[PDB]
Amino acid sequence: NLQVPFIRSLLMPTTGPASIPDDTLEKHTLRSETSTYNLTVGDTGSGLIVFFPGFPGSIVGAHYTLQSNGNYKFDQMLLTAQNLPASYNYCRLVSRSLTVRSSTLPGGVYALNGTINAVTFQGSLSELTDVSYNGLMSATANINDKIGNVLVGEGVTVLSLPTSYDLGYVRLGDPIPAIGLDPKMVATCDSSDRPRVYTITAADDYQFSSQYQAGGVTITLFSANIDAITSLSIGGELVFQTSVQGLILGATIYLIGFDGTAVITRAVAADNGLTAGTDNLMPFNIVIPTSEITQPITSIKLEIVTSKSGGQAGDQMSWSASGSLAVTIHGGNYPGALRPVTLVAYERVATGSVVTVAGVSNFELIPNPELAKNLVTEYGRFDPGAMNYTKLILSERDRLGIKTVWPTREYTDFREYFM
Amino acid sequence: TNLQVPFIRSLLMPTTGPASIPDDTLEKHTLRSETSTYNLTVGDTGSGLIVFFPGFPGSIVGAHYTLQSNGNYKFDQMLLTAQNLPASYNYCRLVSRSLTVRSSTLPGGVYALNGTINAVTFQGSLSELTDVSYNGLMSATANINDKIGNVLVGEGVTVLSLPTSYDLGYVRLGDPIPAIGLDPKMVATCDSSDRPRVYTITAADDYQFSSQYQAGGVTITLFSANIDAITSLSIGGELVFQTSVQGLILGATIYLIGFDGTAVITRAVAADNGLTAGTDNLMPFNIVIPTSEITQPITSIKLEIVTSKSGGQAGDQMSWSASGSLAVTIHGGNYPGALRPVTLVAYERVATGSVVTVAGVSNFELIPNPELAKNLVTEYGRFDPGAMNYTKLILSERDRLGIKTVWPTREYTDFREYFM
Amino acid sequence: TNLQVPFIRSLLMPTTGPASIPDDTLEKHTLRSETSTYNLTVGDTGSGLIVFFPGFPGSIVGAHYTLQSNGNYKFDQMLLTAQNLPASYNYCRLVSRSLTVRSSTLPGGVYALNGTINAVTFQGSLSELTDVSYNGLMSATANINDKIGNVLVGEGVTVLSLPTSYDLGYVRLGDPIPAIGLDPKMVATCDSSDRPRVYTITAADDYQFSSQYQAGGVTITLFSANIDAITSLSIGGELVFQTSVQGLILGATIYLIGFDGTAVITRAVAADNGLTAGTDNLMPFNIVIPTSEITQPITSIKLEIVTSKSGGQAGDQMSWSASGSLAVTIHGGNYPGALRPVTLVAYERVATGSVVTVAGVSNFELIPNPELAKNLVTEYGRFDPGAMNYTKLILSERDRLGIKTVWPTREYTDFREYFM
Amino acid sequence: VPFIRSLLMPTTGPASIPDDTLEKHTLRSETSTYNLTVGDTGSGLIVFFPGFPGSIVGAHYTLQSNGNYKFDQMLLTAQNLPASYNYCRLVSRSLTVRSSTLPGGVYALNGTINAVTFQGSLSELTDVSYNGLMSATANINDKIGNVLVGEGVTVLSLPTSYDLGYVRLGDPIPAIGLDPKMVATCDSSDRPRVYTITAADDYQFSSQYQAGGVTITLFSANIDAITSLSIGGELVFQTSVQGLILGATIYLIGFDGTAVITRAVAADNGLTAGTDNLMPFNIVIPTSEITQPITSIKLEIVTSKSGGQAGDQMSWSASGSLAVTIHGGNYPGALRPVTLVAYERVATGSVVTVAGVSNFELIPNPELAKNLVTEYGRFDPGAMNYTKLILSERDRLGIKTVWPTREYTDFREYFM
């Protein structure tokens, strides 16, 4: 069941929140809240749990399930108990800790059948090499950041060790007041401090030529590995050239999840005509807000369909393209919003049973104007030398025994040692 | 010379070895010190310009320009480090960096060989100079121990890099990202976009154009502003057009022009744009410019309009109004070091057959890409209390100790002797 | 257990860390420890066997076969290590290996789920044995410390890698070299060339064939010998033919057959080869088979020859003769550990809805390729004095103090509890 | 002398190496001096093979003005050791390059030198450019940057393995032929290096007819050899077009980009339609033909047709794999460790001198065995443990595989 100095809240986050001793000040308050889940288990008794230990507002992780034809499927998102954008504007995270285990049985099975393993990968989600049960341990080279072959009778405890300290406040996806004619019309100020852009040159005079087909020919121009969560903007252009007289052009941009599912589709230009000899342009400028993004994204895709009005059995369709495009993800290079990602993979657990991810997460944050009228904020407490003691205990992380994924028995042993 | 530790020792003499900054940005990283040694090709005139970027976060250390016999400069190459960092690592920030520029020719007589160096560093970027002549470089700044001139090329200079800010996060490098396409010449990279730099420019406020017809069109140029860029950028905005005669088409072309005077990037933003009389006609600017397209630093930008007329073979006129604005965004431009401090080591009239060599050592603090992170351990920076405090003391007490950013190498050798 | 020094602590307890061998092969290297955690899928019969290679040089650990409703087997998958070692490494040798085979099922109330484990090890390779049956496996050796039977799956076995020799050179991993070809799939590797196993085979000594014209051709299997190779092999020889009848055209094909009887790769040596009467007609063997197309381990080779006649009636006799020797060259087979020792763990009749796991660590010494050598630092050993003498003294009397190679996890557990 | 002052300063003399392979041998100290003429524009490059089983110590390349290189000569040693010995074993070696004296009529010395040693071979280098050569390794004491040529470098050879056999040198054997230039030798064979490459995996070629042929290059590689090699394998051809005729040549290419060995494995032997017919590779390259070191291999096929000068599409398919067997590639020293010393912009018309001493350990020719006495080496206990200790503590002491010369001089001063 569940429900101070900075370092006790760092290493033991189920104790209470504390101020960060950094050089960034603001009149803030501080608050802890929880996440408790009973995740149901698919038929192939296996699945993956991503967490985001550094994510500063209200999203703890996600949950996928493995399927009989080797693929994944998106179960749900692991958000927290309180909708933090609904009553706070800015925030900055102090600590997390989460436990995940299954020590208990369904009705009508006579055994337990459990294994898990976990890593904390340094880069983002889509840029790791392979998602296997075996090859997951081969992502980091630190002895402390990973553990494997542990039963689910006593589960692994994911701690949140920090990225960096002098960080400003990041803005939550708070609704701002707005009056519209559409009932499904929302307005919000996003998280945008340190954006992550991707430039993608699609073609350097890539010549295309294919024969006629009734309905058009559909090629896919490129792919990537991009992994946004919150929101993104796709700017740029692509320039066409042609020689054949009459042909129509069309394209669309697909955003794909981690499980392999087309999430968001945007028709950049449907059924527009090309002009022979002279140059011709088609731009795209697409804004994708957070409520459209339902699962985490991976690997953008562009495909172009090309048909001909009045085309017969042998005439040629040919064009050449060049261009570049920019995918700006707002708040992408902030520490914690995308970069540290830990993975938990369970397999062969009994179907019909549940795993139980459950942790605390304490914040440091400032309120919206109504709650600002009714709640009082203040500067943080001051004690000297807590920053040097933080640097001391983190400069010897390898030999002191602090790590970031290790089972609940060893974290319990460390807790009664350190307390 | 013979090229192959706390933060003060690695700050004043960067050839000792790397160290971690005592700032409170405590990530897991790995220290790395690499080097760059060039032997340059002095032209026929004997005079050039070696522009260094001291506090640049990674792998680009300078550019070399030879001045022609007619006054113009000519681009030679882009001075950079031995191992390219974005191919193997993923994030970076700079600790310290030294560069020496001298000759290795050493005559056996009693007299020297002719050639003389000036040097200066200043707070602005590269497009913000009044003059780049050999005489006009010691005008650029007003601090005494921040520029030096008339040093002879047997002695040479030492370019030391004193900092700009300390609690500053990591800059992502232009690393390649896995991608599958159909053109074999496509690349997808992740640029550096921590603190961008925007240049808004109002190109026209109801400007009237009116000229006669002739064959081909009337090519004018609207504006020519000075910008700054080493890496990727993007240009946005639109520009309306009004008229009262209807047979008109027009094209537009944008140029990004480097330091020697030639256009590096040319891209047509409009081509056979037919306009209807009586009402507005838009012309949107949606262009991104990648890093690999940019081969040299870019110091200006200009727009051109070619106004012709469809079926206007007699001698008549054509006219339009225009008004609009532009927003040139470069990515990670206002990061301290990315464009803000620059030095200009210039030499003049070096003898024919003499070489001018560039040595140096760069000290970084990296995070690997996911392939190398399978094999190299990363950890937190070991701390020492008071090294930041002693740094602030020494930099407060700077001008009495005479700690310069440009030196003559005999003076820096004697400083390195009497410091340790 | 939870898969996260002197030499003998890493030799007897490999999950402690990588040590270096204190022999006299002095070479710059780096150390790396690697785990491998599999959960096996059992068949409908609940049987099968796991064929470990304990002293293998790099990254191949074993293969998994399942026992079907008949007496045959079926290849499931090759058991690998965590990260692909020839990716980013050139040379490799092995220090230590521990490996367990146990069930991670917790039984209910008071009784246990059914199933047992039988395990041996022997000095010959995989295709040199006699039988692989569960009962018959137990007689594969005459030592008492190298075999154990009727062990419960609830307390499964433990497998060590006790040494075969010490002064071994490094072996080359199967390592890609840069090559700009003309294909999507154009593999160019540097295979494990060392002390090679060769097999010479004399297929015939004047073997006369005689049969009448069947309407589709008469296929005969000329020989069937037992070779074995995990990696790339080569077979080169000469087979001659001399006839009396005249309208004869014959083709031939050679096979490679895995452990489960299924043919792995088919190679047409010479098809539609017309041969004259009165003259000895030559037929060479010039084929190489790379390690990229050997999916499962090979245990047999055979050759078959089909013959036909131009035209043909019901009574056309077809006759020839043959005499020739063939040599199979397995590149690097006699290196001790690549093929020579093998341990056979064989579970039988596991309860349905139960998992068997296999999990252990490997310790290597290995050289990085031209990129990881740019980015990390290798060095020599540590000079543990007299460690080889203590290793010899422990191994020379392993019969007295009870060091085994396959023995259950309770006895290994309290043995290493006593030994720590 | 003991072994370790023969290893740390090999100008003192040779000594037998203390290990467990014990065999009757003699000890020889062998020198090599060169005065290399330099290119018309300055720069150049000198490879070395510091551990090597005998008689080869490196090669010299000059840099042309249009980017490319040029091979001048192979740097041999003084005595031709395969002329009078069967088996060899390297002990120690030191090589110092320098140019500190002016030619007749110029002033102003003008030079610099980069230097680096590398764990892998020569053909597998990322870049050989003067700046990027420095990043080839990460050991801080296995490279040095921009020393003056008037001070030079010193390249000393630290070992790679100790319990090693004796390499058979490429000595001749008595032989009688009919041509005058009939050579028969017994080259180094033991512990080889194989390259197994697959040239095509169902590659489909199709192009229009040309009067003369249509040439395509199927693959490249980066293999390397010095002494001798051998190539084997076979690849098939299947087609539906009736009367096409093809013929292929294989190539061996030096470091500078110029082909050194070309053998025409198929001279215009055509192929039938409807089945598979197939051409084998079995070529043997002597040591006598390889003049400069190999760096790559390429294959190209010239296909043609009897008549039909309008299109006709010339289709065929290929599938096969090949094997190059370098005879003795994985002896430690024979190909693998390399040092790269790159001088740049030295004075025109001047020299750059090298100086070597290479302590060997030999077995005689059966005539020199008639007149010279071989015996087992002298044994003392503890030289091997001392060698292991000092090689294990390499980083804290100063023991570098490439030195600046004055530092090597005063190192030997406060060592002895």
Side-chain angles (χ1 to χ4, degrees), chain C residues 22-29 90-91 167-170 172 175-196 232 234 267-272 284-293 331 367-383, chain D residues 19-20 117-120 124-127 135-140 142 158-163 191-201 203 216-223 232-234 236 275-276 278 280-282 319-323 325 330 336 384-389 391-395 401:
Chain C
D23 59 350
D24 49 354
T25 301
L26 295 177
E27 189 170 0
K28 289 183 281 184
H29 65 277
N90 285 328
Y91 294 97
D167 287 331
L168 285 311
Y170 289 181
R172 184 65 182 265
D175 184 75
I177 51 96
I180 304 298
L182 200 64
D183 295 328
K185 182 60 67 69
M186 192 280 298
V187 182
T189 185
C190 184
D191 282 331
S192 67
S193 180
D194 205 359
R195 46 175 74 181
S232 65
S234 298
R267 181 70 67 191
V269 43
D272 190 75
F285 295 96
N286 293 315
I287 49 173
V288 298
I289 292 168
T291 181
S292 64
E293 64 182 1
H331 302 295
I367 298 177
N369 61 352
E371 291 85 4
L372 193 65
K374 291 181 178 180
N375 287 311
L376 59 79
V377 170
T378 65
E379 62 186 1
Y380 289 100
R382 193 176 288 173
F383 184 68
Chain D
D19 54 352
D20 294 332
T117 189
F118 179 62
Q119 288 295 105
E124 48 183 1
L125 287 173
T126 300
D127 56 350
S135 69
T137 188
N139 295 106
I140 202 165
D142 284 333
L158 291 175
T160 57
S161 295
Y162 272 155
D163 282 336
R191 192 170 166 85
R193 171 175 288 176
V194 73
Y195 291 97
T196 62
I197 61 173
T198 174
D201 191 359
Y203 176 69
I216 55 166
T217 62
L218 265 295
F219 59 90
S220 173
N222 290 117
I223 67 167
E234 194 168 13
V236 305
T275 55
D276 48 352
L278 67 168
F281 289 178
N282 44 7
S319 178
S321 63
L322 308 181
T325 63
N330 289 121
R336 187 181 70 195
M384 186 61 202
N385 297 319
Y386 191 69
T387 299
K388 283 182 176 177
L389 176 62
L391 286 172
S392 67
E393 291 179 354
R394 177 179 178 268
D395 288 328
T401 58

Side-chain angles (χ1 to χ4, degrees), chain A residues 122 127 129 141-142 145 162-163 166 194-197 199 201 203-204 206 220 223 237 339 391 394 397-398, chain B residues 22 24 26-28 167 179-180 182-183 186-187 189-191 193-194 267 286-287 370-371 373 377-380:
Chain A
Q122 186 71 42
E127 61 184 1
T129 64
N142 295 319
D145 295 336
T163 59
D166 272 330
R194 295 173 63 181
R196 175 175 286 173
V197 303
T199 186
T201 172
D204 193 359
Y206 176 69
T220 63
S223 295
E237 79 277 18
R339 277 175 50 191
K391 290 181 179 178
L394 290 173
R397 184 179 63 89
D398 290 331
Chain B
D24 49 357
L26 296 170
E27 296 189 357
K28 295 192 288 184
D167 291 335
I180 296 170
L182 270 65
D183 193 1
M186 64 87 69
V187 288
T189 62
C190 190
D191 298 333
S193 181
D194 196 2
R267 189 171 296 175
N286 292 320
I287 48 173
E371 291 292 328
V377 293
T378 65
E379 64 183 1
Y380 293 95

Side-chain angles (χ1 to χ4, degrees), chain C residues 37-58:
Chain C
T37 63
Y38 285 97
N39 288 319
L40 296 171
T41 172
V42 298
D44 56 353
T45 63
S47 300
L49 86 166
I50 312 165
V51 185
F52 288 149
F53 296 104
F56 194 80

Side-chain angles (χ1 to χ4, degrees), chain D residues 338-350:
Chain D
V338 67
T339 76
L340 277 301
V341 171
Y343 63 96
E344 189 180 4
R345 296 184 68 87
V346 80
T348 63
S350 176

Side-chain angles (χ1 to χ4, degrees), chain D residues 209-383:
Chain D
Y209 180 78
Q210 187 175 0
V214 179
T215 65
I216 55 166
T217 62
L218 265 295
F219 59 90
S220 173
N222 290 117
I223 67 167
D224 50 353
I226 293 170
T227 62
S228 65
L229 58 92
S230 176
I231 296 167
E234 194 168 13
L235 48 87
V236 305
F237 287 102
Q238 300 180 358
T239 192
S240 177
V241 182
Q242 184 65 40
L244 55 86
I245 297 168
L246 57 86
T249 60
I250 200 166
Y251 292 94
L252 275 72
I253 295 170
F255 179 76
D256 52 356
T258 65
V260 61
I261 289 169
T262 298
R263 288 190 178 183
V265 72
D268 65 7
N269 291 320
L271 59 92
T272 188
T275 55
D276 48 352
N277 53 5
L278 67 168
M279 53 180 284
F281 289 178
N282 44 7
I283 55 173
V284 173
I285 296 299
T287 306
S288 177
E289 290 184 352
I290 299 171
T291 62
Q292 64 180 358
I294 311 295
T295 313
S296 68
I297 180 170
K298 67 183 290 185
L299 180 66
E300 63 186 2
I301 302 173
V302 182
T303 181
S304 179
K305 191 183 291 186
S306 298
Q309 61 182 357
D312 300 329
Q313 297 299 108
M314 296 180 73
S315 66
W316 52 262
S317 296
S319 178
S321 63
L322 308 181
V324 184
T325 63
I326 309 300
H327 298 290
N330 289 121
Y331 189 80
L335 287 178
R336 187 181 70 195
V338 67
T339 76
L340 277 301
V341 171
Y343 63 96
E344 189 180 4
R345 296 184 68 87
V346 80
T348 63
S350 176
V351 301
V352 171
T353 181
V354 306
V357 54
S358 301
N359 306 121
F360 293 111
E361 179 176 358
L362 294 162
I363 292 179
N365 204 10
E367 291 289 327
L368 200 273
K370 289 180 183 177
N371 295 116
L372 188 143
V373 173
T374 60
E375 76 271 15
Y376 295 100
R378 185 173 174 87
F379 174 69
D380 54 349

Side-chain angles (χ1 to χ4, degrees), chain A residues 33 52-61 77-85 88-94 96 170-173 191 229-230 290 334-337 361-365:
Chain A
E33 70 270 20
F52 298 105
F55 195 79
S58 177
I59 291 172
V60 176
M77 193 73 76
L78 300 185
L79 71 157
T80 189
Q82 184 179 358
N83 192 2
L84 292 175
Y88 296 101
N89 295 326
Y90 296 94
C91 180
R92 185 175 65 181
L93 182 138
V94 180
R96 291 182 188 272
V170 66
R171 178 67 173 268
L172 267 302
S191 66
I229 293 173
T230 57
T290 309
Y334 184 76
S361 66
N362 43 10
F363 294 98
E364 179 181 2
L365 74 172

Side-chain angles (χ1 to χ4, degrees), chain B residues 32 83 88-89 372 374-376, chain C residues 32 83 88-89 372 374-376:
Chain B
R32 182 67 181 168
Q83 178 184 2
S88 295
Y89 294 102
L372 201 153
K374 291 176 179 179
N375 291 316
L376 187 63
Chain C
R32 185 75 191 276
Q83 53 103 26
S88 71
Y89 291 104
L372 193 65
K374 291 181 178 180
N375 287 311
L376 59 79

